[PDB]
Amino acid sequence: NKKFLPFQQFGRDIADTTDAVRDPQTLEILDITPCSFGGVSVITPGTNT
Amino acid sequence: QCVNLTTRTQLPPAYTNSFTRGVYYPDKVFRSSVLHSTQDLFLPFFSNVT
Amino acid sequence: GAAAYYVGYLQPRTFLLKYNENGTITDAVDCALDPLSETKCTLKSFTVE
Numbered sequence: 001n002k003k004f005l006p007f008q009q010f011g012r013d014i015a016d017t018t019d020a021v022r023d024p025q026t027l028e029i030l031d032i033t034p035c036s037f038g039g040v041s042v043i044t045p046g047t048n049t
Numbered sequence: 050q051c052v053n054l055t056t057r058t059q060l061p062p063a064y065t066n067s068f069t070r071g072v073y074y075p076d077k078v079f080r081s082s083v084l085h086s087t088q089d090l091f092l093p094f095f096s097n098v099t
Numbered sequence: 100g101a102a103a104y105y106v107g108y109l110q111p112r113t114f115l116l117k118y119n120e121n122g123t124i125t126d127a128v129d130c131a132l133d134p135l136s137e138t139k140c141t142l143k144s145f146t147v148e
């Protein structure tokens with residue numbers, strides 16, 4: 001929902017990476033949310049139980 | 050041509066000061082609410098502009 | 100007739116910027132002007148306590 005000037009293409013975050021973009025073919029404001037959510041947690045009781 | 054100016058005055062190149070002028074976008078990259086800082090070919094503050 | 104135009108020279112300085120919500124440059128702070136500007140660029144903030 002930001003204010004992209006027509007030359008402004010790349011939104012940067014505080015972490016200085018790519019945040020918000022625009023298609024060079026069609027003028028449109030986009031937002032990016034990265035994939036690879038978290039890790040694997042395993043719950044188990046005692047094996048003898 | 051070779052015709053000179055009518056009232057060409059031989060004046061020296063006098064000096065003033067660029068107060069906050071010469072602040073350009075370093076690239077075509079959008080930012081939001083951050084305090085970025087970088088080095089590029091700038092207009093220095095308060096220097097003798099002709 | 101009455102006409103004014105000014106000439107500046109570009110030099111590799113280092114500046115501090117401030118962006119608003121809309122992403123325009125709101126404020127510009129030099130680094131290598133005085134040790135106060137050096138301090139403001141060192142702290143990555145122009146509000147030194």
Ligand SMILES: *[C@@H]1O[C@H](CO)[C@@H](O)[C@H](O)[C@H]1NC(C)=O
Pocket residue numbers: 064066095096097
């Ligand atoms: C501009 O140049 C003159 C000498 O030509 C010098 O005295 C003056 O300090 C300079 N201006 C600044 C802001 O340094």
Ligand SMILES: *[C@@H]1O[C@H](CO)[C@@H](O)[C@H](O)[C@H]1NC(C)=O
Pocket residue numbers: 119120121
């Ligand atoms: C952003 O632009 C809108 C457009 O009118 C304005 O109302 C708002 O105050 C601006 N915000 C900033 C932080 O400049």
